[model samples]
Target: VRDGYIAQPENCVYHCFPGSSGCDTLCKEKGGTSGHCGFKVGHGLACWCNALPDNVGIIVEGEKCHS
Candidate 1:
């Protein structure tokens, strides 16, 4: 059950700094969730996620860089 929402931006993908084991936690720190280190182009292992930055928002407010 859910009853909350936001600007609802589309899912954005990016590489987390830390490795696989750490990427999940690190991704939380970076501003995402359920991140996992996976293979990408020209890269060994990187964090892959459907998480969005905390700052990601609407046109009026703009994106939030920091918490």
Candidate 2:
């Protein structure tokens, strides 16, 4: 399986409050190998998950995962 770090797609992007653990938990539930909270260009803080490309479901146009 192909593996890499990838941001949750736009439609699937979990809106997370900063410093909250919910993001990480939710990400793992969605099949991410690992997850963390980070900033998106226009989306503020959100969950970024690392997983196989196919595990993330749909693709969308947006900023990649970043702090």
Candidate 3:
């Protein structure tokens, strides 16, 4: 099992999908069943593009979830 997040360090480009966290129990991608973020910053209510797939799970951050 893996754990990660779908994120954009910047807001210029947005709303990327298929952002799988690789964690069987949790995924930070939009529409992901377990996209519940661990912090108040998010809680499945957020969804956005993640340009840096390699950087996922390696850091704890929030991405812009809307237009």
Query: Which has the greatest TM-score?
Result: 2
lDDT by residue for model 3 (26-49), tens:
343433344433322433323332
Per-residue lDDT for 1-67 in model 1, tens only?
A: 1111222233223344555465566545655555565544332233454454646431122333122
Candidate 1's displacement at residue 2, Å, is 21
- Candidate with the larger TM-score of 1 and 3: 1
Give candidate 3 misplaced runs (Cα > 4 Å).
Answer: 9-29, 39-67
Q: Which ten residues in a row have the lowest lDDT in candidate 2?
A: 1-10
Candidate 1 segments whose C-alpha is farther than 4 A from its true place: 1-20, 54-67
TM-score to true structure, per model: 0.43, 0.54, 0.20
Ranking by lDDT: 2, 1, 3
TM-score of 3: 0.20
lDDT of 2 by residue, 1-67 (tens): 3332234554434566565377667666777666666655454445566664464642234544343
lDDT of 2 at 19: 54
TM-score of 2: 0.54
